[PDB]
Design a protein around this ligand. Sequence first.
Ligand SMILES: Nc1ncnc2c1ncn2[C@@H]1O[C@H](COP(=O)(O)OP(=O)(O)OP(O)(O)=S)[C@@H](O)[C@H]1O
Ligand SMILES: Nc1ncnc2c1ncn2[C@@H]1O[C@H](COP(=O)(O)OP(=O)(O)OP(O)(O)=S)[C@@H](O)[C@H]1O
Ligand SMILES: [Mg+2]
Ligand SMILES: [Mg+2]
Lengths: 364, 406, 134
Amino acid sequence: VVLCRESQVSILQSLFGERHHFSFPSIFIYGHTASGKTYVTQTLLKTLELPHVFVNCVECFTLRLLLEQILNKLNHLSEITCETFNDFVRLFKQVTTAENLKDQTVYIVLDKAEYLRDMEANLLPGFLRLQELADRNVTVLFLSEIVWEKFRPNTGCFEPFVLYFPDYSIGNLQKILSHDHPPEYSADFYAAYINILLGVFYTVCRDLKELRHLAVLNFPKYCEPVVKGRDTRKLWRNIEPHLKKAMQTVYLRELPYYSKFILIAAYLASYNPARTDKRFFLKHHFPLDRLLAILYSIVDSRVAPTANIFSQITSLVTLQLLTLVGHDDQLDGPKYKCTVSLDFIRAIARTVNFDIIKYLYDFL
Amino acid sequence: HTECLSQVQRILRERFCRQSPHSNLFGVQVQYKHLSELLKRTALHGESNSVLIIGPRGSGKTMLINHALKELMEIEEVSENVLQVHLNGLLQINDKIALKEITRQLNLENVVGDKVFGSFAENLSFLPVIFILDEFDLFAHHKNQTLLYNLFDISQSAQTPIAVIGLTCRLDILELLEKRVKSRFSHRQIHLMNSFGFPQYVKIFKEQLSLPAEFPDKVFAEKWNENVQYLSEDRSVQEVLQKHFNISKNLRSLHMLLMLALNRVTASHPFMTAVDLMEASQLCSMDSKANIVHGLSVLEICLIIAMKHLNDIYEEEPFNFQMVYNEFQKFVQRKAHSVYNFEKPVVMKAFEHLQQLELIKPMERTSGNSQREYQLMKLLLDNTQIMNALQKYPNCPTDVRQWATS
Amino acid sequence: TVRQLESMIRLSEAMARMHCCDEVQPKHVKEAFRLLNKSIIRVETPDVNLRLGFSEYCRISNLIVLHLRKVEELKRSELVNWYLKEIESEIDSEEELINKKRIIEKVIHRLTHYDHVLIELTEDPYLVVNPNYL
Ligand SMILES: Nc1ncnc2c1ncn2[C@@H]1O[C@H](COP(=O)(O)OP(=O)(O)OP(O)(O)=S)[C@@H](O)[C@H]1O
Ligand SMILES: Nc1ncnc2c1ncn2[C@@H]1O[C@H](COP(=O)(O)OP(=O)(O)OP(O)(O)=S)[C@@H](O)[C@H]1O
Ligand SMILES: [Mg+2]
Ligand SMILES: [Mg+2]
């Protein structure tokens, strides 16, 4: 069922008209992430009991897979394999002559159409003007989050009808969340739950799926106090700290000794200009050699150039902590960059008893 | 009652959506006369000609050819001798596919052969047939333009009569051809421009929404004609038509607007109203960027305001995540105790979501070497657009509004 | 540095001398703390929608949040009654009373529905403070 979605449903029902009637060659529907495009369109198609083929652009990452899946599903509704768009058009003309497909509009539902512009140049113009080429009462729908302005080809083509799905509101979200209340408690109980949840998290999280997931996760702790024995103040006081703990993660859901020195030296080399190197290390007043010199300066003990330190360097490269910049064949002048956050390097420095801030030129 | 509404809905939907042929022609009398005369010359005699038709997309390029063919094919038994081949630049992208389509349309696959053999001398040695070439500009982008050169050669030859018709939207089609084919191309060009004034556009609108004389109910048809005639001189309808005519003179947009207007026709309102046309025009003329901005959240609005401040302070220069975070921290730190205590990961996820909506695009794309942080980002919006969108924001807080004004 | 602390003590003494009070009270310290904090200052704060100043808006918000947080260790009408009891020392006419009633109703509604600092719990709804306001 759909709630607070009656204008678009009526518009689509008026657009469809009767089964024998014709419609637009292309309709472009765009909206937000939690707008419910798939839900609304598929529920409407199921309710009207119309011949429709549901296709995911992601699954059909190749043209042959897309065309073969479309044709096979259409045949199942009414083995065939095709390779080219012209052959697909010819076979589509051959297959659409069924009695069940004689005086009815054919609907091709496509979702996640953002990837269509990266498949082929002429595929989108071919899909847009399908009704002219086939002349067999065919309609194609589009579902996307990107506006039509970025779907326009350079040469220009047949303009589809643009449509927008309205964004949700406080009352709309509250109705949707309170519709599926648990049968084991009163509707007003779940309504109060939804009210406090919306009052807490509507500022950041407007996603219906995510807010509903949060409610599902946190409901048992909502219902514990009453089981333990309509006290609004009692519930709020018992439950408030848990809500603050939960909000800490809205969207979120021990190196060897010499490795730490290598990491801190790499961070220093990355974030310190070379002109100030002697100013920080020379006793009196990026390439691998600079790193070696800095490492030799930092460590109070004489470290031998054993191959194990080179193995540590390569392993750190593997662990995506250090990124190789130069060519792989050039292993005599290699370039590196450090991708470690500043808080991480400060934390690892503390476990070593080293003050990295005193050597950072930028802070000074 | 209901049956009449259903029938008129079906007829008008067929007229607009499928673009069914109609006897009405607007400002194309001379062009159609020339094209029909030359087609008759090419049909009744063995002479060959080549013509290109140039016009903007949606200007009824195909309609002229279809009407001329329907007028001239049925003249005599010449249509029995006349053969027609239709080729579209979109379906046929390779010369092999074009040759296969030509062979299959001529029903000569039995004569030529079934296998994938590349020899085409079976047709060439044997070679009145008319050729229709949709999207003629695409054929010029082939590797060697072999098909076009062969068609021009056989047109210039004295073996068999061949008629070549091409459709092109580009105005520079003459310079997209090679020297040889350009020399062998008969310089026959027809230009399709909307060379008519606003009153003529009003007449076109009045005629298009007029019921045909073949409708069963005659008094209802006369009342519909009276309604459309009365609606013709209404100044609100004229204002909407003037706006759409200033935007573009193409008939395709007018057909779309008329179709959308007819969607709001129900039993309770058998005859249209100027308010219906106003609603259709308003729905057809909305900007998508403001609609996208309207559906955002508070944190995204604050980030966008910080982005605008960055663009103002640093005139037309890129930016990254760290500077935006630093100045958002500055804003939330100047205020004493505002409820915006958010950590780094949530702001990073918000920035990722904003980049996903393609309001921000990277420069000189690379990955691995540079993280998502420290990446050169740019905004794809205008300051006046942000101000207008924020003006219509439902529940924009005072603090963020005053920060935006600052 | 300590020089600013000495300046703060001097400012408290100046406030005490202004009011002809033989002893220094913490209200002087609270008054001087703002003036020490402000630093960069605009010519005039913009109006807030009948218009009300930003400083007064912050003052009302701070007072109401402090009272609610203190009571935590209420009702809309009860809180309005407390506010009218507290502001009695300034109102001198009935027109000022009705204006203050208008202002407080508008401020409470605005904080409830735009700034989200106040959360409604189900004609006299219970009001609670958003737990992330300091
Ligand atoms: N109008 C609605 N009425 C009822 N449930 C809805 C509505 N809109 C969304 N939902 C529910 O929310 C869920 C998530 O919405 P989606 O359908 O995933 O959003 P979407 O618009 O299809 O965006 P995509 O394409 O999936 S990224 C749906 O599966 C429904 O259960
Ligand atoms: N002179 C005309 N007489 C009648 N209808 C016209 C005329 N010019 C344009 N039209 C109409 O304009 C509408 C749009 O033209 P289209 O037929 O879509 O364009 P086209 O001829 O297919 O050209 P392309 O480049 O292939 S899209 C059709 O419904 C035509 O009937
Ligand atoms: Mg979906
Ligand atoms: Mg055409």
